Enzyme design. Structure first.
Site, PDB file in Angstrom:
ATOM      1  N   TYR A  34      33.960 -17.332 -25.673  1.00  0.00           N
ATOM      2  CA  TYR A  34      34.869 -16.588 -26.610  1.00  0.00           C
ATOM      3  C   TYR A  34      35.868 -17.508 -27.297  1.00  0.00           C
ATOM      4  O   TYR A  34      36.866 -17.087 -27.877  1.00  0.00           O
ATOM      5  CB  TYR A  34      35.602 -15.428 -25.942  1.00  0.00           C
ATOM      6  CG  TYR A  34      34.819 -14.208 -25.562  1.00  0.00           C
ATOM      7  CD1 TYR A  34      33.448 -14.174 -25.543  1.00  0.00           C
ATOM      8  CD2 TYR A  34      35.514 -13.046 -25.242  1.00  0.00           C
ATOM      9  CE1 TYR A  34      32.785 -13.017 -25.187  1.00  0.00           C
ATOM     10  CE2 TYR A  34      34.829 -11.859 -24.968  1.00  0.00           C
ATOM     11  CZ  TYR A  34      33.448 -11.845 -24.928  1.00  0.00           C
ATOM     12  OH  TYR A  34      32.701 -10.694 -24.666  1.00  0.00           O
ATOM     13  N   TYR A  76      33.017  -3.014 -31.030  1.00  0.00           N
ATOM     14  CA  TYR A  76      32.804  -4.283 -30.316  1.00  0.00           C
ATOM     15  C   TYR A  76      31.331  -4.698 -30.380  1.00  0.00           C
ATOM     16  O   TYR A  76      30.440  -3.875 -30.244  1.00  0.00           O
ATOM     17  CB  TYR A  76      33.230  -4.119 -28.844  1.00  0.00           C
ATOM     18  CG  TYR A  76      33.425  -5.403 -28.110  1.00  0.00           C
ATOM     19  CD1 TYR A  76      34.364  -6.338 -28.538  1.00  0.00           C
ATOM     20  CD2 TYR A  76      32.749  -5.723 -26.924  1.00  0.00           C
ATOM     21  CE1 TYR A  76      34.580  -7.479 -27.875  1.00  0.00           C
ATOM     22  CE2 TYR A  76      33.013  -6.939 -26.243  1.00  0.00           C
ATOM     23  CZ  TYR A  76      33.940  -7.798 -26.735  1.00  0.00           C
ATOM     24  OH  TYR A  76      34.294  -8.976 -26.046  1.00  0.00           O
ATOM     25  N   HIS A  77      31.128  -5.977 -30.672  1.00  0.00           N
ATOM     26  CA  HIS A  77      29.828  -6.628 -30.788  1.00  0.00           C
ATOM     27  C   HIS A  77      29.070  -6.302 -32.062  1.00  0.00           C
ATOM     28  O   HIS A  77      27.867  -6.576 -32.121  1.00  0.00           O
ATOM     29  CB  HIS A  77      28.969  -6.420 -29.522  1.00  0.00           C
ATOM     30  CG  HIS A  77      29.459  -7.191 -28.346  1.00  0.00           C
ATOM     31  ND1 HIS A  77      28.975  -6.966 -27.076  1.00  0.00           N
ATOM     32  CD2 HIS A  77      30.318  -8.220 -28.224  1.00  0.00           C
ATOM     33  CE1 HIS A  77      29.511  -7.823 -26.244  1.00  0.00           C
ATOM     34  NE2 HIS A  77      30.334  -8.593 -26.897  1.00  0.00           N
ATOM     35  N   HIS A 125      31.632 -11.619 -32.559  1.00  0.00           N
ATOM     36  CA  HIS A 125      32.908 -11.261 -31.968  1.00  0.00           C
ATOM     37  C   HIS A 125      34.109 -11.345 -32.906  1.00  0.00           C
ATOM     38  O   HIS A 125      35.210 -11.588 -32.442  1.00  0.00           O
ATOM     39  CB  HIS A 125      33.206 -12.148 -30.707  1.00  0.00           C
ATOM     40  CG  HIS A 125      32.361 -11.846 -29.534  1.00  0.00           C
ATOM     41  ND1 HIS A 125      31.024 -12.174 -29.457  1.00  0.00           N
ATOM     42  CD2 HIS A 125      32.636 -11.108 -28.420  1.00  0.00           C
ATOM     43  CE1 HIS A 125      30.517 -11.650 -28.338  1.00  0.00           C
ATOM     44  NE2 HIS A 125      31.480 -11.042 -27.692  1.00  0.00           N
TER      45      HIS A 125
END
Length: 482
Positions: A119, A333-334, A422
């Site tokens: 990340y 998210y994603h 992300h």
């Protein structure tokens, strides 16, 4: 001015990470060591699939990387268009895909990073080096800055580039998804998500210095940012939350103007957008507008809740947002979004949270912006065509003559080829280009910016826009180092 969606495209893996392949313009997607779920440790491999923009074929999922599970990584494109992916589930690993060896060819290894991580954000510097910082999804140790020299296949820690200055005040992974923007003479601006912005120098042993607060903004994890006019030093920022999860995202909108590295960054607050977003994606288009798609209000992972289903088109000249056609599938998210060489925008993904998980979205669509339609907003416009470029690899400062099929008054831009996962896309930037007409309204000559902090090395899409604003399908070229 709502544009239009094309048909739903379905991949055999959730497209949590996506990259535009240089020269072909195909769309490469990947999940992890599985098609439909992930683990922190990973499965020691990655599944990938490819969408062919010319035929519409979607390839079967293959194990294209046999050594690195590239879920949750850093991504950057280097000076030669190679896609360099760092860390993630295989936290210490660096892998490379060189499209020249074939789009479906194996990812190969590069040197492991000095500090294992996931990340993180990665960016290509003015020197063609790859800078990473942060990233606490996976890995070990304080996730400080390091730099990859692709000519020496070495990673070097930069003592003068500590992560501490950029860490957010609250929440999970507070050192992660930094808004990294490469700039002059090896500098990198961390524009966020922390409200404290910082300059980093990637040369030597490194250095860092405060760049100021981002106006009166709060910490904005998984907000979005994009350098929409690199010549003017202009970055748009939007949304995000005071923590990774658990807070309401914002609709806060700012334009940052970069002067010299080390000097304060100027911040202008804009009217808020209509929809507060966390986990959205933002995409710069050839005309300098920015599309903001997806995201949710109350931020939670692997969740289809409080979705923002209406994207917004932002015009940085006027500071104004307008809604575009809504989608039906949440892109939270994603989710991913990416500019294509045909000037449409991929939007898809979301989830990656187990077998038969209802939050998994294997699909997406391409959005055609208003500039592909006539003034009714619904009839496909006749597009101009680039008939030739005088060169496809040029240094900073160098001229390129663009020959158009049809005479006209044209404007031009170069948009750097990119990749995203992300919410992080450090590779995309736009450079407007003024062309000198060769005397027939067909041949126009531009020059690439002289500063490599502006024209970061690597592959770009050259767009030409007719007098009404309609773009051609882009031609690829690269900016090379000395």
């Amino acid at each position: 001015n709502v544009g239009k969606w094309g048909p739903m495209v379905k991949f055999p893996v959730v497209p949590v990470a996506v990259a535009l392949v240089p020269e072909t313009g195909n769309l490469l997607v990947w999940s992890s060591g599985w098609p439909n779920r992930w683990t922190t440790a990973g499965n020691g491999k990655t599944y990938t699939s490819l969408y062919n923009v010319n035929t519409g074929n979607i390839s079967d999922a293959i194990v294209q990387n046999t050594q690195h599970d590239m879920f949750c990584p850093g991504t950057s494109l280097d000076a030669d268009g190679r896609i360099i992916v760092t860390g993630g589930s295989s936290a210490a690993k660096t892998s490379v895909l060189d499209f020249k060896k074939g789009e479906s060819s194996p990812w190969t290894p590069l040197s492991n990073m000095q500090i294992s991580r996931g990340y993180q954000s990665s960016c290509t510097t003015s020197e063609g080096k790859i800078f990473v910082i942060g990233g606490s999804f996976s890995g070990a140790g304080t996730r400080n800055g390091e730099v990859y020299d692709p000519k020496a296949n070495t990673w070097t820690k930069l003592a003068g580039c500590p992560v501490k200055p950029l860490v957010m005040q609250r929440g999970m992974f507070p050192d992660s998804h930094a808004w990294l923007w490469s700039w002059k003479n090896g500098s990198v601006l961390q524009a966020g998500p922390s409200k404290k912005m910082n300059w980093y120098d990637t040369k030597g042993t490194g250095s860092n210095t405060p760049a100021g607060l981002r106006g009166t903004d709060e910490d904005s994890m998984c907000g979005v940012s994009v350098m929409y006019d690199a010549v003017a030093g202009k970055i748009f920022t939007y949304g995000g939350g005071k923590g990774y999860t658990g807070y309401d995202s914002t609709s806060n909108a700012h334009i940052l103007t970069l002067g010299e590295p080390g000097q304060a960054v100027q911040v202008q607050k804009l009217a808020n957008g209509k929809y507060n977003r966390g986990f959205a994606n933002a995409v710069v288009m050839p005309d300098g507008k920015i599309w903001v798609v997806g995201g949710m209000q109350k931020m939670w992972l692997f969740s289809d809740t409080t979705p923002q289903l209406t994207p917004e088109l932002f015009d940085p000249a006027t500071g104004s947002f307008t809604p575009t056609t809504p989608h039906t599938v949440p892109r939270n998210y994603h989710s991913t979004a990416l500019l294509m060489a045909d000037a449409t925008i991929w939007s898809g993904g979301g989830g990656l949270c187990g077998a038969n998980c209802k939050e998994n979205h294997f699909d997406g669509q391409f959005w055609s912006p208003p500039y592909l339609f006539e003034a009714d907003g619904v009839t496909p416009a006749k597009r101009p065509v680039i008939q030739s470029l005088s060169d496809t690899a040029v240094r900073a400062g160098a001229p390129i003559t663009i020959t158009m099929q049809d005479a006209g008054a044209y404007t031009f831009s170069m948009i750097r080829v990119s990749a995203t996962t992300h919410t992080v896309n450090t590779d995309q930037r736009r450079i407007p280009l003024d062309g000198q007409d060769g005397g027939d309204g067909k041949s126009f000559t531009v020059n690439v910016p002289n500063d490599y902090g502006v024209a970061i090395p690597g592959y770009y899409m050259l767009f030409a826009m007719n007098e009404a604003g309609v773009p051609c399908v882009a031609q690829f070229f690269k900016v090379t180092l000395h």
